[PDB]
């Protein structure tokens, strides 16, 4: 059952180890396409002949095209920022995509079908429908749907469009046919569960188009529809979506995050109750699976339980899960029949399917619990071009109930149901090929997501007790938290130095040493990324951490931030002990050397 | 240097993959260059012992099985490839070879153009593409970028208009002296340039001003009506829905018998709203309409705006040139300067844009394109008439300062979408650098398309058929503004419009493929209905000219139209078209015989 699937065979390789394989398969596919143009329908005629191809103007034009491509080729290689290789690159980026996804794009692009125009793309249109079904099955939706989006931010925007329109439907039904919602107060109309709204819409029958005309689509009083509650670290990104969708940026309300950088569910409830008390509705809540700088996974199960509790008090909220980064990781929890694996059996199933090379606990109970609850969310974002290992650009959205698409649809198949317009069939081919090489369960993506998580854990373990002596100073590595997923963060700190401004200065100077300045010829032996956790975006979420290092709350406010060394361990190659242990002493040496340069330059 | 003998035949794989080996040779060179770049003392994580292990070989075989399934679907669940001379429908899938090759190569890096660090070369390429767009459109101080598609480019244009309309009031809220003495009506009719100048004068206050703009969600419907040609009414309802003004704020403007926006109607509509003190959020003019290839009189709209400004009325102008945008290259000389009308045929002959020295471009089309530089924003799609592979749309803005009105905190800060592939920028860049956006490059390609359309149009206006005792005529719709050509077949003297609609639908079914078709057809067409809700009475003059009554028009509610968008480059040559002409005629005869059988 794909038991001994070997991930090394599914990538070009950091050193182009499988380059010839890629080239061979690429040429086979291109040959298939060229043969199809030539022979699929004999006649023709050929519009271009040898007499044309051997003319001087033709040959000149080929030379001109070569000059353009050679220029393009040179610019990309000259400006490029040396290829990241496993063991040396421990930063936030990844440029290693699945070979079948690459090949499928290359091949399908030759037909250049547009997936909104079926006639140009019958094959890739069907592939995108299957991808939608595969997303729905991955998320445990029994009657859901999904599609590929131009990118992940547009997928989130589409989720908000869904929430906005759905929230407005009971009022739209009241205006078109009061009998549909007779005996319900306006507050009750604004707190109707989504499935009930959808049932009512379907029940409007002949009147559905008229109801849609009176919904948020009409633009009437969008701020009546309530507040959009998001983790504080996502507040800025959601302001843009709220701005675009017309509810306005003040309708986005930040919810504090905790010391795990997950949404604080006690705070979530307090905020909801505050608005409910003044009869301000909640348009929706966003839970994050795989935060941008910490890989944190919000307690989706706790949010769902909270909603169930509040419904007894007449409060409902739409739930959107942003699993842009963490979506494919749900494949860890589905067996070969796509059934959700009970927690007590997870390590057993993972060993049987060689998901992890060592039998240990990698997935936290609270992470498992969050993933289990995804099937309760109205919508979920999941991006193939993040942890799906599909080339940019490919985002994704999944909806709980296929009927939801009727709330945003425009008529006169696929094009009627989406926010965007024209879209490449090649993208659908690319995602489809990835999904069919690696099924969305433990037999396929479970292994790939597993390899990444295992690499993260090895790196975390390596950092945990790391100590250095530089110019007579003891310097310690302090990992931020044990990873919920595959992102690992840490700070370097001079022992006994309790000046937080100085620690930030250290980690900033360290990052600059362990990174490239453009025009860089030499590849380094250790590259990292970085970010700041600043009060305006993080609140006091990092306070317990900085206090654990010996800093005071007074010190925390004086600095107003903490600088963090960042890794997103997306490479699949660091799961093997042999592979990581080879690099461990070399990383240690690189860090020692970088720290020396830092201290030397003062 | 001037690319005088640039040969379009060398720039495509070809309908029969005539240039297939060239594509492969160039592709392999590029792939080799990337692979060698990755290879530039560490051990390899994928060793030779790994690659020769049984599990590795088994996995490779698994991958090959998947790609074989992919291949079967795409090859066999397909509509046959378009064959020039036989295919006269509304679509095109052929792409410029350098655009394909550039994408193939760049995507190997998997750069993301919102993260410059991830993609410095392709980020520069997208900036250059934006500048190239601005130059094509005559915008001395403008900018642009690639968008996922044209519908999103239109949405972004509306986002701009919406935010910009709201800025005068926003400025009043933050600093009344910026707009002292200005009534609310004056605030709602400030020309965009004045708004941008004031916003620049606001200096560091810009961020607080933006908080009080339409970004706040407040007073969206106060911003006024969005006026679009009737044939775009439905598509703009979706954009207005998304952006929060609401579909109720979209107002259809009647189109004329040339399927161009009626500018007298536009003026009547604007004056009526302005007399009520309802502002106009904006007007959309279309260059290259969806089913007729019509070009609105952008120049007439610009002149109307100037007239109305004297009376305290302003409107934002967005030009939707998704289809017709690259055709502006017909009007730019080798130094990208607009060609005087009297010199157009001379310059076109000097540069082999057209195969004959005669008139091809209507004066009113020339005039419309010349006025583009007065529009606040313009949509243009590389994946339509730029021959770049999907997905690649585009937007151009008149004044770079406009991007400050929609920005969030380079490139990612200034756009509606998020992540965008560096490969997409490479693909557009390679097309633009192979074919400059003037008569030396795209002029030739857009010209070849227009000329094919003209030959087809001339051929259609002399066609009669004797079939099953009946006499059938072809009636072309209108002379093309661009490269779209439409017609109807009709039984002579038959005044039943429902019957004519029946005939044209049945003809289309004979002259089209289905998924899985294998028998080659000598003639393929597309079709659409011009129905009253989208067209109003614009086709009434046409149907009356054929003998149908106005009563008959209302009875049927629509007219069925046989559709062609001549995007092939090969029908510009007389020798080529004249070969297929007798064949098309015989195919129409045969298809009609089947219809009437
Ligand atoms: Mg000028």
Descriptors for this entry?
binds magnesium ion, homodimer, alpha/beta, 21 helices, decarboxylase (chain A), six-stranded mixed beta sheet, PyrdxlP-dep_Trfase (chain A), seven-stranded mixed beta sheet
Instruction: Order the strands across the largest sheet of chain A as they lie in space.
Output: 2-8-7-6-5-3-4
| Straight-line N-to-C gap of chain A | 59 Å
The total count of helices of chain A amounts to 21
Spatial shape of chain A? globular
**Major sheet details of chain A:** 7 strands, mixed
Beta-strand level of the residues of chain A, as a percent range?
Answer: 5-15%
Structural class of chain A: alpha/beta
- Overall tally of structural domains of chain A: 3
Pair of chains with the largest interface and how many residues each contributes: A-B, 153 and 148 residues
What is the number of E strands of chain A?
A: 13
- Give the helix level of chain A as a range of percent: 40-55%
- The oligomeric status of these chains comes to homodimer
Rg of chain A, Å, rounded = 26 Å
Bound molecules: magnesium ion
InterPro entries (chain B): GrpII_AminoAcid_Decarb, PyrdxlP-dep_de-COase, PyrdxlP-dep_Trfase, PyrdxlP-dep_Trfase_major, TyrDC_C, Tyrosine_deCO2ase_bac
Pathway (chain B): Amino-acid metabolism
Cofactor (chain B): pyridoxal 5'-phosphate
Protein name (chain B): L-tyrosine decarboxylase
Structure description:
In chain A, strand 5 (282-288), helix 12 (300-311) and strand 6 (318-322) form a beta-alpha-beta unit. In chain A, the strands form 2 sheets. The first copy, chain A, has a 7-stranded mixed sheet with strand order 2-8-7-6-5-3-4, with helices on both faces. In chain A, 43% of the residues lie in helices and 12% in strands. With 602 residues, chain A is an alpha/beta fold. The first copy, chain A, has helices at residues 19-39, 50-53, 56-79, 99-109, 122-138, 152-176, 186-189, 194-203, 208-213, 235-245, 265-277, 300-311, 346-352, 365-372, 425-437, 445-463, 500-513, 535-538, 543-548, 553-559, 577-600; strands spanning 89-90, 145-149, 227-231, 252-255, 282-288, 318-322, 379-381, 395-399, 467-470, 473-479, 487-494, 527-534, 561-568. Chain A has 21 helices and 13 strands. Chains A and B meet through helix 1, helix 3, helix 4, helix 5 and helix 6 of A and helix 1, helix 3, helix 4, helix 5 and helix 6 of B. Magnesium ion (MG) is lined by residues 138, 373 of chain B. The PDB classes it as lyase. Keywords: L-tyrosine decarboxylase, lyase. It forms a dimeric assembly.
């Amino acid at each position: 059952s794909l038991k001994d699937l070997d991930l090394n065979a599914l990538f070009i390789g950091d050193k182009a180890e499988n380059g010839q394989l890629y080239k061979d398969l690429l040429n086979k596919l291109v040959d298939e396409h060229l043969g199809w143009r030539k022979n699929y329908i004999p006649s023709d005629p050929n519009m271009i002949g040898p007499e044309d191809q051997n003319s001087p103007a033709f040959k000149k034009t080929v030379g001109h095209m070569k000059t353009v491509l050679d220029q393009l080729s040179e610019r990309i290689r000259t400006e490029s920022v040396p290829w990241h290789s496993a063991g040396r690159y421990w930063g936030h980026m990844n440029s290693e995509t699945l070979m079948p996804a690459l090949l499928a794009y290359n091949y399908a692009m030759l037909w250049n079908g547009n997936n909104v125009a079926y006639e140009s793309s019958p094959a890739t249109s069907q592939m995108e429908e299957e991808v939608g079904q595969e997303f729905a099955r991955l998320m445990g939706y029994d009657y859901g749907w999904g599609h590929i989006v131009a990118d992940g931010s547009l997928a989130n925007l589409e989720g908000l469009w869904y929430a906005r329109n759905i929230k407005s439907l009971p009022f739209a039904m009241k205006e078109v046919n009061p009998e549909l919602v007779a005996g319900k107060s306006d507050w009750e109309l604004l707190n109707m569960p989504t499935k009930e709204i959808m049932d009512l819409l379907e029940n409007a029958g002949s009147q559905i188009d008229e109801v849609k005309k009176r919904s948020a689509r009409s633009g009437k009083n969008l701020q009546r529809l309530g507040k959009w509650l998001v983790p504080q670290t996502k507040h800025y990104s959601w302001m843009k979506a709220a701005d675009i969708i017309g509810i306005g940026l003040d309708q986005v309300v930040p919810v504090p995050i905790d010391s795990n950088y997950r949404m604080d569910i006690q705070a979530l409830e307090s905020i909801i109750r505050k608005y409910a008390a003044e009869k301000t509705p909640i348009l929706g809540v966003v839970g994050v699976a795989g935060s941008t700088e910490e890989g944190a996974v919000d307690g989706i199960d706790k949010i769902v339980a909270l909603r169930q509790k509040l419904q007894k008090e007449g409060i409902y909220f739409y739930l959107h899960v942003d699993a842009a980064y963490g979506g494919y990781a749900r494949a860890l929890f589905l067996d070969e029949d796509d059934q959700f694996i009970p927690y007590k059996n997870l390590q057993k199933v993972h060993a049987e399917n060689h998901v992890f090379t060592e039998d240990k606990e990698y997935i936290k109970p609270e992470v498992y619990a969050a993933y289990k609850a995804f099937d309760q969310a109205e919508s979920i974002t999941i991006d193939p071009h993040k942890m799906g290992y599909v080339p940019y650009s490919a985002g994704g959205i999944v909806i709980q109930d296929i009927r939801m698409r009727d709330t945003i649809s425009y008529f006169a198949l696929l094009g009627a149901y989406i926010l965007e317009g024209s879209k490449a069939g090649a993208t659908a081919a690319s995602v489809w090929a990835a999904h069919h090489t690696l099924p969305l369960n433990v037999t396929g993506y479970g292994k790939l997501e597993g390899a990444s998580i295992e690499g993260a854990h090895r790196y975390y373990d390596f950092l945990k007790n790391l100590k250095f002596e530089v110019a007579g100073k003891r310097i310690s590595v302090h990992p931020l938290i044990s990873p919920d997923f595959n992102m690992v963060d840490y700070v370097l700190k001079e022992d006994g130095n309790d000046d937080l401004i100085e620690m930030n200065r250290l980690n900033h100077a360290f990052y600059e040493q362990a990174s490239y300045v453009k025009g860089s010829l030499y590849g380094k032996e250790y590259i990292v990324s970085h970010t700041d956790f600043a009060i305006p975006d993080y609140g006091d979420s990092p306070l317990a951490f900085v206090e654990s290092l010996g800093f005071s709350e007074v010190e925390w406010r004086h600095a107003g931030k903490v600088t963090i060394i960042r890794a997103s361990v997306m490479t699949p190659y660091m799961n093997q002990r042999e592979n990581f242990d080879y690099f461990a002493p070399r990383i240690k040496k690189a860090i020692q050397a970088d720290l020396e340069k830092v201290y030397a330059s003062v």
